[PDB]
Every structure is written in structure tokens, then in C-alpha cells.
Write a protein that binds this DNA or RNA. Structure first.
Ligand SMILES: [Mg+2]
Ligand SMILES: [Mg+2]
Ligand SMILES: [Mg+2]
Ligand SMILES: [Mg+2]
Ligand SMILES: [Mg+2]
Ligand SMILES: [Mg+2]
Ligand SMILES: [Mg+2]
Ligand SMILES: [Mg+2]
Ligand SMILES: [Mg+2]
Ligand SMILES: [Mg+2]
Ligand SMILES: [Mg+2]
Ligand SMILES: [Mg+2]
Ligand SMILES: [Mg+2]
Ligand SMILES: [Mg+2]
Ligand SMILES: [Mg+2]
Ligand SMILES: [Mg+2]
Ligand SMILES: [Mg+2]
Ligand SMILES: [Mg+2]
Ligand SMILES: [Mg+2]
Ligand SMILES: [Mg+2]
Ligand SMILES: [Mg+2]
Ligand SMILES: [Mg+2]
Ligand SMILES: [Mg+2]
Ligand SMILES: [Mg+2]
Ligand SMILES: [Mg+2]
Ligand SMILES: [Mg+2]
Ligand SMILES: [Mg+2]
Ligand SMILES: [Mg+2]
Ligand SMILES: [Mg+2]
Ligand SMILES: [Mg+2]
Ligand SMILES: [Mg+2]
Ligand SMILES: [Mg+2]
Ligand SMILES: [Mg+2]
Ligand SMILES: [Mg+2]
Ligand SMILES: [Mg+2]
Ligand SMILES: [Mg+2]
Ligand SMILES: [Mg+2]
Ligand SMILES: [Mg+2]
Ligand SMILES: [Mg+2]
Ligand SMILES: [Mg+2]
Ligand SMILES: [Mg+2]
Ligand SMILES: [Mg+2]
Ligand SMILES: [Mg+2]
Ligand SMILES: [Mg+2]
Ligand SMILES: [Mg+2]
Ligand SMILES: [Mg+2]
Ligand SMILES: [Mg+2]
Ligand SMILES: [Mg+2]
Ligand SMILES: [Mg+2]
Ligand SMILES: [Mg+2]
Ligand SMILES: [Mg+2]
Ligand SMILES: [Mg+2]
Ligand SMILES: [Mg+2]
Ligand SMILES: [Mg+2]
Ligand SMILES: [Mg+2]
Ligand SMILES: [Mg+2]
Ligand SMILES: [Mg+2]
Ligand SMILES: [Mg+2]
Ligand SMILES: [Mg+2]
Ligand SMILES: [Mg+2]
Ligand SMILES: [Mg+2]
Ligand SMILES: [Mg+2]
Ligand SMILES: [Mg+2]
Ligand SMILES: [Mg+2]
Ligand SMILES: [Mg+2]
Ligand SMILES: [Mg+2]
Ligand SMILES: [Mg+2]
Ligand SMILES: [Mg+2]
Ligand SMILES: [Mg+2]
Ligand SMILES: [Mg+2]
Ligand SMILES: [Mg+2]
Ligand SMILES: [Mg+2]
Ligand SMILES: [Mg+2]
Ligand SMILES: [Mg+2]
Ligand SMILES: [Mg+2]
Ligand SMILES: [Mg+2]
Ligand SMILES: [Mg+2]
Ligand SMILES: [Mg+2]
Ligand SMILES: [Mg+2]
Ligand SMILES: [Mg+2]
Ligand SMILES: [Mg+2]
Ligand SMILES: [Mg+2]
Ligand SMILES: [Mg+2]
Ligand SMILES: [Mg+2]
Ligand SMILES: [Mg+2]
Ligand SMILES: [Mg+2]
Ligand SMILES: [Mg+2]
Ligand SMILES: [Mg+2]
Ligand SMILES: [Mg+2]
Ligand SMILES: [Mg+2]
Ligand SMILES: [Mg+2]
Ligand SMILES: [Mg+2]
Ligand SMILES: [Mg+2]
Ligand SMILES: [Mg+2]
Ligand SMILES: [Mg+2]
Ligand SMILES: [Mg+2]
Ligand SMILES: [Mg+2]
Ligand SMILES: [Mg+2]
Ligand SMILES: [Mg+2]
Ligand SMILES: [Mg+2]
Ligand SMILES: [Mg+2]
Ligand SMILES: [Mg+2]
Ligand SMILES: [Mg+2]
Ligand SMILES: [Mg+2]
Lengths: 72, 49
RNA sequence: GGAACUGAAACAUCUCAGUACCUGAAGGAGAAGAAAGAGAAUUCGAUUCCGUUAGUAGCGGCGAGCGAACCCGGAUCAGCCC
RNA sequence: GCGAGCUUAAGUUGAAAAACGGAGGCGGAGCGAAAGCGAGUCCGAAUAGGGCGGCAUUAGUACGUCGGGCUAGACUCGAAACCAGGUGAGCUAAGCAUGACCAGGUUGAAACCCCCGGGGGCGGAGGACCGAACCGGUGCCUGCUGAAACAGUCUCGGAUGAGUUGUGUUUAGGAGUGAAAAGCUAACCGAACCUGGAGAUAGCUAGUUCUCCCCGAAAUGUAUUGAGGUACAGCCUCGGAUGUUGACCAUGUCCUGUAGAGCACUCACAAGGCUAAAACCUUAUGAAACUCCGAAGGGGCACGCGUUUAGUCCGGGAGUGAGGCUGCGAGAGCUAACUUCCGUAGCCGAGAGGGAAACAACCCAGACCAUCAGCUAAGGUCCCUAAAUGAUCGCUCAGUGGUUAAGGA
RNA sequence: ACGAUGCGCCGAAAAUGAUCGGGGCUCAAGUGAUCUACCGAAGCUAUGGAUUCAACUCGGAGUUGUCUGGUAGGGGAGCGUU
RNA sequence: AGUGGACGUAUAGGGUGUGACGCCUGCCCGGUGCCGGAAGGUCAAGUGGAGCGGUGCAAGCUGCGAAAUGAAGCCCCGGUGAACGGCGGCCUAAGGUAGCGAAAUUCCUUGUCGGGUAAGUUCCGACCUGCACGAAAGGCGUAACGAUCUGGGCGCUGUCUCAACGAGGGACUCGGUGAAAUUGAAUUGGCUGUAAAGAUGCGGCCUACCCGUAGCAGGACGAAAAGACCCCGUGGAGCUUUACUAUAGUCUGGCAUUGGGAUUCGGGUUUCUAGAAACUUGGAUUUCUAACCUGAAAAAUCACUUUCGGGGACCGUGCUUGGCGGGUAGUUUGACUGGGGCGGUCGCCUCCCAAAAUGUAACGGAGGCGCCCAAAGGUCACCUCAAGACGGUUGGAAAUCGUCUGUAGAGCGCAAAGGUAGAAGGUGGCUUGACUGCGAGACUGACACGUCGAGCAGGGAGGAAACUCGGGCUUAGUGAACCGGUGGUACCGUGUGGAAGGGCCAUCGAUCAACGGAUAAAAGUUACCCCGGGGAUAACAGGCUGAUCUCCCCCGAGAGUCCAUAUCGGCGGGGAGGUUUGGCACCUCGAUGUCGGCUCGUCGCAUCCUGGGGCUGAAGAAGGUCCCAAGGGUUGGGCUGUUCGCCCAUUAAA
RNA sequence: CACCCCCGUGCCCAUAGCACUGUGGAACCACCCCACCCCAUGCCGAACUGGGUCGUGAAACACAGCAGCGCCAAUGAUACUCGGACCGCAGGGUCCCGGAAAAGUCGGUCAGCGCGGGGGUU
């Protein structure tokens, strides 16, 4: 063994209560650990970036049912 | 040898070449797609070479 | 005739360098010199030396690095003979 | 100094003095790969960008000093080597020419001649024997700042041969010579000596001196024919600008899958009932790569509803890139190590002062200077040794105190 | 009689000479609990004194505050020799 | 040029290896070498120049440029061993002929038996199981020889038990002369502790009047040479080869020196009733003597002449071609690494570690990638998976159909984590957005790279539309830079116009996998070693630890007929000591001398003897075993360097 | 939001779901109804789908009861932990302050809020 692979510094890049420019990246994820609410659009590797400038808010009933909206 | 190859694709009238891998696998001869280079509209591309 | 350390953080091309060194000819100097040239204005008008153009052009495992010439400004300016 | 401009170089003329000398250099426009356009420009088929001017038009240039950089010995000393042209065979390694030397004793080959290959004579051969010179060094000892930079006593090898030795002479540097050790080549030969290239290179070592003030680190990350070295960050400092942006703490909010805890999936696993035993139920458990769950804390934002003083960028100079311990949390180890590797806090490095007998790390506490002044921290108060042989309820009669455990009493 | 426990006994052998730092300590100088009183540092306080910075005043000075452990290093003021 | 070989000439000269003499010297031509062959494969310059292009109005000039023909040499085919060699592992060209064998070769090893000694790791003779013998890198013998090595025996000895007495030269005392290595400074003790872990110098405690002198050799990690061992340096040098690169030398084709001619000519021209005389441009054998080389004669090397003699247009030399070329030369030969080597590893992806942010090491624990898919894409539309039970045709535990349960227990191309049931899974229709030009904004990184990305243009594709497309559910499927190939484009293109060449856009060439990648191009060895450094780092020794080692204790199964504990103590547990093999890397690489012996010793006690005890399966005696006890004592020899161990022969005991 | 009830479509996002079950009927919805063709089944008008009344609330669906199941879930007490301060040689553990689960019990629920329309008491 003695093998390993680079860190992928994934996360909630922008936490609810953070104003965001358009195109800011807010969550990094392997998949849909977050499912993108209103105003946000999710990319190829399933990072989801805000489309509209404003505050970031978490809709989060959880269990795969967590969504990131942006409010203007 | 190799299996898959990087084939080229010249336009009708021949200005361009898009180049992408096919594969001698299922594609035993066929190579006919399309794209837009010098002319406005996308034109037929014979990816034989 | 012609180095090698050395640099290239190794090392062959490269550089170190036509350096060091050996050998020949000669003088108070020597060399060179009176355009089958530079050069791109149909200009220049022997040779040598300084400033500059200029680290420009360019050469280079296009790497380490190596590097002009013309224009122009001065020092000195004689062209003579087969 | 002059300033939207600033200034010479070579030289020329003077020199107890400096002036002339505009060739030339820098600023003035940028974009582009370039043609080339031009406050615009490249990409492109037009519109999205990059660099750039407007705007803050940030003023440049010739000198002087100084901080750095470059190139050249480039802070000083220090290689083993490499190359060039020489000097050396008067030592030694061989050759050649020519001369010389080897006491003495022992043995008795052929050949030659007689009696029958054998006996006798005779003869005087030998890389023969012994042993002096001489040549050589076999073993111990002595000598070991020697009598001597290789010897001495004693012992030993040869000693007519492949011998010793004089003179003269030839052969040398990757070259000679070598009955072959890489031996000898002028007392250090796996490539002599001298002069030179030449201050070779040296990522390696050591060394780098007058004083005071102020600030003050790093031993981390990534990259590397890289690991004891460098590049760029990280951290230090000096100046300019900015102007609380810092920092702790509080509120609000969001994100997390550890401790714990649980079996709901995966692996495991404990007693039974049930049954063609997988499955199933009651009961019972462990889990870094298991999670129905899940804190404490922790990170980002916003505020400051509150105390504080740092921060940010831009320009000059750095060094550091070997860490050490302790406590907590893990891995590796044997739940070893003054072990090794990470996270984290503090000390040490760079830290003096009191305590811990002594003692970088522990506990107390950050030394501007002076005092034969006062309160305290940790730690202490019998004598050493500063300070209650303090007070009150006990506990242990073991010197336990002043070195462990399973286990026994 | 099994039990909880507080302090102790045994368990308990290493190499030059012993020891809690020593003396000595139960007629506490051991101990657990409380409470004082003092010793005790270059920490803090007092008086004097000077630098770093910063405000505040007059054409470095002086006041008030504050700061001053220090390796590589960066900066600054100065002393000595030809 | 000249010399040596050699004023020698195959009974001689050169090289290589065996190494008198004796009997001898087996097998294997596969590779390598070499010697022959030389049907065919390939192979340079040169001869040829068909064609492809520029540039000019053109004549012409000019850049490339094939086919065929071109030597040696290599591939191919024989052979060669007193050529390099090979003659073994529960197919290779073969597999060991004689002879020898525990060897100078034997690891296990002190092999087994015998010999010799009281005792024999040695030695000798047999045996053979030859780790890992062997036939001219010679095998088996050999008389004689050896300052050769090994074992034995005689002889005599101070080698020794075990030393004594004597001599002389020192050594010591006095007078004369009088150095040296060394040297931080010294007002320089013992223990025990402590500190970088071996203290005169720090702590406590003990001891010690000042100073000499003759002695000894424990300490001052004493002295001496900035460790010759080990590691490091993108140090060095010597040596090696099928590392790389060249190259003296050497072989080979063509051109010149270099020429007449006959002879066969694939061919040239004007020549003539498909044709041949003048004639060749050459090639080829063959031959010739003026070039040249060489030799003999009064004139030694050289020149002349030579009635002369031989070779001969070759040989030698100049240029150029291609091959051979460790003989020479200049160099390359990676790093991490609980010391170097060996093994392993070097880039990208997944998980745990990673301590609920991101991040985080290890030669820590697990596994994947160097691709795929013309549809496994885009879009539009449509289906729902495991598994179980009941029932069923050839099948039955599990083919296939049928019902019931069925937030998933399936699937997702490969590894896993996330994710997923309104789909990313499955199945069709259409087509290529697997587009060109851009990139607001962020994530991430020291850089450099990397990730995601709304929306705009031109134009597509699917859908009735909203809309979705600039690749795949996601995360691996990858290499800057240089130097070049291919297609466009029309920017530079040196006087001008062109072209040669260059630039740009596209694309291709990389286990450069040591994966940020030193060159286009590179292996060993050093014990003949050299330098510079390191206690940054091994071998010793001390230290820390104590796995392993040594010891004790608890339990108690059984053994002990009986009876656990007179003794012994399974399977398990607890400690101690620091003597073993270690680990670790702390002081020491400007030096800490290392194993065994000898000489001196002193200490512990886990006690071999001796002394005092308890219990005993203790009648007695001799014992066993435990307790207290460190005063003293603890033998001599054979074997081996040994420690050890074995043995001889004794002991209170060894 | 006059009172109920139906069809649909949201918010919510198992305290709403399962099962047992009863009411429902041409009003709404639902099966049945036929198929050459629109349109379709990798076979079947089962599914889409096109043409409709009877019939029937069977099934599905809506709505009520329902605490067997699931779903939620205290308090209390711990586990653990931020800071402080300690002991054990060690594995380990204690104390002060404050934050504080998970599991279980107690107990809670077969929901809760809109919007448009259709038909009822005519
Ligand atoms: Mg491993
Ligand atoms: Mg170099
Ligand atoms: Mg070199
Ligand atoms: Mg010169
Ligand atoms: Mg000269
Ligand atoms: Mg002269
Ligand atoms: Mg701008
Ligand atoms: Mg200046
Ligand atoms: Mg400076
Ligand atoms: Mg600089
Ligand atoms: Mg030097
Ligand atoms: Mg003799
Ligand atoms: Mg004899
Ligand atoms: Mg000799
Ligand atoms: Mg003799
Ligand atoms: Mg030399
Ligand atoms: Mg040589
Ligand atoms: Mg010598
Ligand atoms: Mg030099
Ligand atoms: Mg480093
Ligand atoms: Mg830097
Ligand atoms: Mg800020
Ligand atoms: Mg703030
Ligand atoms: Mg746990
Ligand atoms: Mg954390
Ligand atoms: Mg505000
Ligand atoms: Mg700076
Ligand atoms: Mg480091
Ligand atoms: Mg560390
Ligand atoms: Mg372990
Ligand atoms: Mg350590
Ligand atoms: Mg270490
Ligand atoms: Mg330091
Ligand atoms: Mg400090
Ligand atoms: Mg201190
Ligand atoms: Mg202490
Ligand atoms: Mg003290
Ligand atoms: Mg110290
Ligand atoms: Mg200190
Ligand atoms: Mg310490
Ligand atoms: Mg304390
Ligand atoms: Mg006081
Ligand atoms: Mg106190
Ligand atoms: Mg007192
Ligand atoms: Mg106990
Ligand atoms: Mg009292
Ligand atoms: Mg007081
Ligand atoms: Mg005080
Ligand atoms: Mg003070
Ligand atoms: Mg004052
Ligand atoms: Mg300070
Ligand atoms: Mg201070
Ligand atoms: Mg200071
Ligand atoms: Mg031999
Ligand atoms: Mg034997
Ligand atoms: Mg032997
Ligand atoms: Mg032999
Ligand atoms: Mg025997
Ligand atoms: Mg034998
Ligand atoms: Mg042989
Ligand atoms: Mg022999
Ligand atoms: Mg003899
Ligand atoms: Mg001899
Ligand atoms: Mg003998
Ligand atoms: Mg005597
Ligand atoms: Mg005497
Ligand atoms: Mg005297
Ligand atoms: Mg005298
Ligand atoms: Mg100690
Ligand atoms: Mg210590
Ligand atoms: Mg002392
Ligand atoms: Mg002292
Ligand atoms: Mg002595
Ligand atoms: Mg050294
Ligand atoms: Mg050395
Ligand atoms: Mg080398
Ligand atoms: Mg040659
Ligand atoms: Mg050639
Ligand atoms: Mg070589
Ligand atoms: Mg290495
Ligand atoms: Mg993390
Ligand atoms: Mg680290
Ligand atoms: Mg899909
Ligand atoms: Mg888009
Ligand atoms: Mg579009
Ligand atoms: Mg359409
Ligand atoms: Mg092209
Ligand atoms: Mg390269
Ligand atoms: Mg790398
Ligand atoms: Mg030598
Ligand atoms: Mg050192
Ligand atoms: Mg060390
Ligand atoms: Mg050691
Ligand atoms: Mg050892
Ligand atoms: Mg020393
Ligand atoms: Mg010494
Ligand atoms: Mg005892
Ligand atoms: Mg006794
Ligand atoms: Mg008895
Ligand atoms: Mg004894
Ligand atoms: Mg509670
Ligand atoms: Mg608190
Ligand atoms: Mg805490
Ligand atoms: Mg609490």
C-alpha cells in the first residue's frame, strides 16, 4: 500500500448568512449532498454556484433534502 | 499496435479538421459527422483520412 | 601549432579560448592599407585607433551563454609604383 | 542642479585653475506574434475580454553618497585532481660497450685405458656440496623525540653462475623499465619533479575584529539527479499610502460526522426456540476503513449593540527551510524507549530571576538603569538555611515517609 | 461471617561506600481536614534617574503617558586610526 | 624518414597458455571468437539523373530529386576446444572418460570408523551425502629439492611448575653541557547523584597540614595523524566491459601519382549495300617497360652509369567512402531509505488515519488508473430494480412465466466513497452541442497547472412547447518546455519583385512512468585508493527501553500407589535484573583500539565448598529442597585463536 | 371561512405512513364498454390511446373509526466535553465550573394550512 490521493478541499464554500456575487461557488460536493434551491445552478461535478447577487439561505429538512437558495 | 485511433475530419471544400478519437471497434469504416468552421452553417464532415 | 581545469550546479555539441603555452619573423614598433569593398541614399571612397550605435541585430543542447557591422562623432589623414 | 525637459562620450584648447565639445543616451504612446494601426490596440465574422490612455496628467534627468543585483578571483584561507612546456636514469628499473672480482676444503660425470653393463685406474665435469670475502635479508630481540628518515647483535639464504662489481653510455611521464609487487623511475608513484594555466572549482569546513538605541524571526508548504543545498510562498525589518479594516469577546446564523452511543444497513459475534440448515424470533455484544443517532467544541459570514490596537497593500534588505521537550489526541512500536511520524497548546531554541539538593523543557515569573526600602507568586517556616518546635480533630509505630505488582495477612 | 474503605506489613536480589540534599524527625520535623502569621523573585509597589514612540506646547527642547529579555537579521545615533 | 626483429629467413622469428619427468588429457559448435564458403537478404560515396519545383517574355539559370547499377563488411551456411567457455534443476549443445574427494575446494562440521595421546575441533588412513573436484585457467602420481606450511616422535633445555643468585650497560647521587613531543587557563580529592546520557570543576556527604623525591600506569574519554572502516559530496583518480561517444590503428570502394597495347567490348559520332573500316568514354581479364619500387657491380647511406637483374601501372602516398576498432581517450553509472546495500517506492484516483471547518506524516492500514463508449453522447418519449414465499413444461437450492410483499436491501463500463426511486438505472426515435469565437464571476495552488461556470455572437440538434445541449452521474484515464512531421493562412522574408526559409491557427511524435520531466546520445569496479566533510550516520563501548534472555512469585490441573504443594508443576497471570540477540541513534568520525590469552585485581549474591537452620517420601549413612550466611576458598592437563563446550585425572568445591 | 361533499393542484415535507376496517355512487371519480382507422404494444386496447350509455361502488380512490405496527418523543439521570486544577510509573482515572447527548421510560399522532372549480340544503 502506502498509496493515497490528493485532497479535494470540498465543502460548503459559502455558509448561510453570506452575501454572494453571481458565479460564486457555495457548495462543493461529490454529488448532490446539496440540491440547489431558487437562484442557484449546479455544474458538472455537481458544485452549485449562485446566478443572482444576494444573501445565501439554506433550506434544509435534510436526509438528502438540503437545498441552497439565494435571496435578493 | 493500437485499437482506437485519432482520426481527422475534413469539410466538403476542405478548410478544416476537427480531430477526435473514433475506435476500430464498432466503427469498422463509418465516419460522417458535421460541424461549422469557415461557412456559416454546420456542414457535412467526412472523417475518413 | 594549439590546451585543460572551469561554466553548463552531471556531461559529449557549447564554453572556458584562439585564453595559457610552444615555436618563427621583426622593428622602435608592428600589423594593415589605396575597394572585383561597405551598403540601400542611385550615398560612401584607403588603413589603423577612441566614442557611439548596443547588448540593437543575431548566434546558442535557442541552454550556460556568445555578440557584430553600417550611419554618426573624433585622433591622423599622402597615395604612389610595375 | 535644471526641470517637461535633463545631460554628454570620445576628444580639442588650456592647465598653480577648467571651458568648449550634441555624435549619443533617458523622459514624451501604447497594443500586437508582425505587417501595421494609433489613444487607441490584439483576439474575432462586432461588440465578451486582455493589456493601455482618460481619470490620481503621481515628472523627468545629470550627478554624489549609500542598500541591494549583475559580470570578473568578488568576504579570507583550504583540496585530492586536470592540462602545457620543460627538468631529471648522478637513486632505482633494464640494455650496450668495455674492464675487473669470487680464500680455502668436499664430491668425483663423460671421455680414455686394463680385467670379467660390472670392478680397477685415470681423468677433472657440474645453473653440484660446505664455507670466507662479496652479494642477499630468514626469525626473534633491541632500537621506536634512534647511533641510523629502514639499522644493530645474534641466526639465516647463495657462495663458477640465470653470478658480483667499476667506468662510460642509452631508454622517461600515459612514458620508460619490470624472472610481475602496480614494483622502480633522486628518501610519499594505481601515473615523478618544476615552472606555469592559476587567486583552477570547492552545494564542503573553519574564520570575519569599535560602541550604544529600536524592532525581531524560521527550522513550515510545494518543487527539485532534491533531501546538510537552492527557487517561490510562509514568518522579520525599513519607508510610503491607507485608515480601523486588526485582535479577543458577545449576539445571530449557517456548515461538520469526532467523543459518546447504538445496531437500522456491512463484517463479526454470544445462549436457546424454530425448522431440509440461508432465512426467522426472544435474549445478548464489538467494530479505523459500520452508522437509526449524535454533543462539547470548531470553522465562515454579519454586527459591535464592547473592551482593545493592531491590520492591508506597495517598494528596499534579509535570514530561516536540521528542531528539542512536556501535556492532551491519534498512527507506527511491545499501550517499550531521553524511539520514530503527524495534530495541538505552552516552554527551550533566542530567556536572565525564585522554586524543583543538583537540572534548556517542569512550577512560579518576561531582567531600562541605581537603593544597606515595601507587598506578594510558585515554593516554604526543627538545624544546615530566610520564615509559626503554629493551632484543632484525627491517621499510621512501619523509618512507612524516603522504589513497583499479582497475591496473601 | 462475608463485605466497602483510611494508613500501613509481606511480597521486594547487583554489582567501588552509604544516605529523604544532610542532620535528625513518632516527646512529629510524617500524614488527611481546616485556619491563619511570616519568609520568600531581576514579578508588583516607593524615590531618583535615561532612552523608543506618541500626543502637547514654545522657534532636537520641556511636560504627561508609554516602552526598553534577546540568536540569524533589518534599521538608527555615534567613538577610535592613517 | 630511419631502425629493431635481423646482417636472422619456417629445425627461424612473434604471440598466448600450460610448466621437469610418468600415465595421461573424456563429453558438448548451441551462443562468442576465429578459419573457410560466399545461392540469397541488407549496405556508403560514386555512376545515373527519369520526374517534382522555382525565376524569367523567352534562350537559359537554378533547388530538390528517384529506378537500376555501386566494395569490404553484417545476416546466412560448414567447421574449429592445449579458442572464450559449459558439463544441472526433487529441458539446454550437452550433461562428468579416467583419476581424486570432509581437499589449500566440506556449508551442516568437532561427519562416521580406525590410527596416534590419559585426554585429539588439529593431523593421518579409509568411507563417501563432492553446499561448491576434474583433466595443458591441466587431473592423478612422483625420487630430489624448500630460511615453505601442517602433524608427530626422539634429544636437551629456565618456555614453564617458580623463580633464585651473579655479571655488565642504563636507571639512581655530584660536578660540566642540556634538549623534546605537549601545553584554554588552573588554588586540579573520594563516593553517590546530576547534568549532551562516562564530573577534579554542578548537589550533598565523607576525607585531605605546606612542598618534594624514587617509583607504578587506573583516571586526565592522556599524546600523535582535522578516522585509511562507515555514510554524504549531481568530489577525484586507477582498472574493467557486448554502458555512451569519439579515435590512433586497421580493412574497403572511387578519384590523382598513372602509362602504350593487343584481347571480349552493354554503348559514341561522321561514317556505307536491319550495317562496319576510321575509332573509343569507359569496364574486364591478359600482356608490355619509358612512370614508380627494388637489387647486384672499384664508388658501404646517397648520386651516377650500368653488358645490367626482378616486380610493376599493382605496391607505396594524397583526398574522400563505408566497416572493424577498451588499444587509446573523455565521461555517464537517480533518489527515498529509523546507517549503506538488497527488497520495495517514485505520476494520477478512492477510503481510514485526519483529532465533527479546509488542511495534515509515516518503508502506516486497504484498492484501483495509463482506458473506454458512433453510442455507455444531445435531446425527446417511455419502463423500475434486488430478494423472498405460494404455483408451476423437459428445470428444480438458483433457468423462464405467474401472483403477493417489495424508499431500495439492486443497478450505475472498470476501485471505492458520495450520490441516486419524480433517475444518474433500463428501452426506442431522431441528429450531432464529442460546435467555432468569448468569458462575468468564483473555487485551488508558492508558482506553473488545474476545477466549476451564468450569460453574448455566428450557426446548428431534439421537443408542440417551457427548455436542454460547447461530451459521459462525479472524482483516475495523464506529461511544461525545446527540436521536427502534416493542413491551412498570407504576417516577416535583408535593394526591389518573387521564391527558399520563418511566424501564426489546427493537429501529430514522450513507461522523458526517476511521471515539474539535467544530453540528441552512458554500465561497472577499487582492499592500491586519494580529497572534502559527518557523531547530521553504522561497526565497539556507555545511555534510554526491556520484546527476546536470566531470575523469582501466584494459582493449581495432574504426576507423586494413596496424599496437589517431600519433590515436580500443564494451560494461564504477576513482578524483578539488566549479564543475551536486539530497538533506538543521545555524547564521541580534528579517533572512545577492537576478539582471545597473560598480569593484577575488587565488587554483587540469584551461594559450587565451607558454617547455622526448616521440612522431607529424614531409620542410619549418603541426599533432596527451601531459609540465614559473601570470611575465606574454588585444581592441573589434551583439543581449538578461541570464549565457550567436550574429554583426562582430582576435588570440600571445581 | 353560510354549513357539508366531490374533482384537482399546491405548502408541508411519516406527530401525516401501514395494516384491520366501515361509509360512499350515476353528482363527482373509478372499472366495465367497443376498435379498420388517430395513437401504441421490442407479444397483449394491460399501458398509453380514440369512440360511450347502461352496469357497478366490486376493485382503485375519497372520507371517518382505529394506538396492533410503525413515526415522534420529554422530564430525570447519566456518557462525553470547553475552560480551570489534580493523581496514578502505567494502562488509566478524579475534582471544581459550565455546555451536554444517544439509547430507554413518561407521553404524543393515525395530521396540519391554502387556491381555483363542480355539484348539494332550491
Ligand atoms: Mg505497508
Ligand atoms: Mg560543471
Ligand atoms: Mg570537463
Ligand atoms: Mg600567448
Ligand atoms: Mg614569441
Ligand atoms: Mg629575431
Ligand atoms: Mg484599467
Ligand atoms: Mg544613482
Ligand atoms: Mg543593507
Ligand atoms: Mg538584489
Ligand atoms: Mg583556493
Ligand atoms: Mg652451486
Ligand atoms: Mg645433498
Ligand atoms: Mg632484492
Ligand atoms: Mg642450509
Ligand atoms: Mg604533471
Ligand atoms: Mg597506455
Ligand atoms: Mg622512491
Ligand atoms: Mg582558469
Ligand atoms: Mg534542505
Ligand atoms: Mg523568497
Ligand atoms: Mg480586513
Ligand atoms: Mg473586528
Ligand atoms: Mg466509539
Ligand atoms: Mg477539527
Ligand atoms: Mg455596521
Ligand atoms: Mg520586500
Ligand atoms: Mg526539515
Ligand atoms: Mg515537528
Ligand atoms: Mg502497536
Ligand atoms: Mg525524540
Ligand atoms: Mg531523531
Ligand atoms: Mg538554533
Ligand atoms: Mg520565548
Ligand atoms: Mg528560568
Ligand atoms: Mg530535582
Ligand atoms: Mg539552588
Ligand atoms: Mg544546557
Ligand atoms: Mg539557558
Ligand atoms: Mg532535559
Ligand atoms: Mg504550582
Ligand atoms: Mg513578604
Ligand atoms: Mg502562599
Ligand atoms: Mg532560621
Ligand atoms: Mg495491592
Ligand atoms: Mg506541633
Ligand atoms: Mg503576610
Ligand atoms: Mg524582592
Ligand atoms: Mg524592573
Ligand atoms: Mg528625571
Ligand atoms: Mg524587546
Ligand atoms: Mg523587559
Ligand atoms: Mg535589546
Ligand atoms: Mg599456470
Ligand atoms: Mg576431520
Ligand atoms: Mg585439512
Ligand atoms: Mg591439487
Ligand atoms: Mg579420533
Ligand atoms: Mg584426510
Ligand atoms: Mg583445462
Ligand atoms: Mg599446476
Ligand atoms: Mg631433503
Ligand atoms: Mg630458494
Ligand atoms: Mg616439529
Ligand atoms: Mg641480582
Ligand atoms: Mg648489577
Ligand atoms: Mg648533572
Ligand atoms: Mg663547559
Ligand atoms: Mg541521573
Ligand atoms: Mg541527564
Ligand atoms: Mg566533588
Ligand atoms: Mg567552582
Ligand atoms: Mg612508563
Ligand atoms: Mg575527516
Ligand atoms: Mg577524510
Ligand atoms: Mg566520477
Ligand atoms: Mg583513421
Ligand atoms: Mg566515415
Ligand atoms: Mg575507458
Ligand atoms: Mg543515497
Ligand atoms: Mg478534516
Ligand atoms: Mg509536517
Ligand atoms: Mg436520463
Ligand atoms: Mg452555457
Ligand atoms: Mg445558441
Ligand atoms: Mg421544430
Ligand atoms: Mg505548412
Ligand atoms: Mg531532454
Ligand atoms: Mg519530481
Ligand atoms: Mg600501492
Ligand atoms: Mg565536526
Ligand atoms: Mg548522533
Ligand atoms: Mg553500539
Ligand atoms: Mg555486536
Ligand atoms: Mg580530541
Ligand atoms: Mg587521542
Ligand atoms: Mg541470600
Ligand atoms: Mg550444609
Ligand atoms: Mg543421614
Ligand atoms: Mg567470591
Ligand atoms: Mg435531563
Ligand atoms: Mg467554564
Ligand atoms: Mg479540558
Ligand atoms: Mg458536568
Amino acid at each position: 500500500n502506502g498509496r493515497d490521493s490528493n485532497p479535494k478541499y470540498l465543502g460548503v464554500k459559502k455558509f448561510g448568512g453570506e452575501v454572494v456575487k453571481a458565479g460564486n461557488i457555495l457548495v462543493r460536493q461529490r454529488g448532490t449532498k446539496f440540491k440547489a434551491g431558487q437562484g442557484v445552478g449546479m455544474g458538472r461535478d455537481h458544485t452549485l454556484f449562485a446566478l443572482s447577487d444576494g444573501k445565501v439561505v439554506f433550506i434544509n429538512k435534510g436526509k438528502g433534502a438540503r437545498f441552497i437558495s439565494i435571496e435578493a | 499496435p493500437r485499437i482506437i485511433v485519432k482520426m481527422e475530419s475534413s469539410a466538403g471544400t476542405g478548410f478544416y479538421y476537427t480531430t477526435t478519437k473514433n475506435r476500430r471497434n464498432t466503427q469498422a469504416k463509418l465516419e460522417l459527422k458535421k460541424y461549422d468552421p469557415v461557412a456559416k452553417k454546420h456542414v457535412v464532415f467526412r472523417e475518413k483520412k
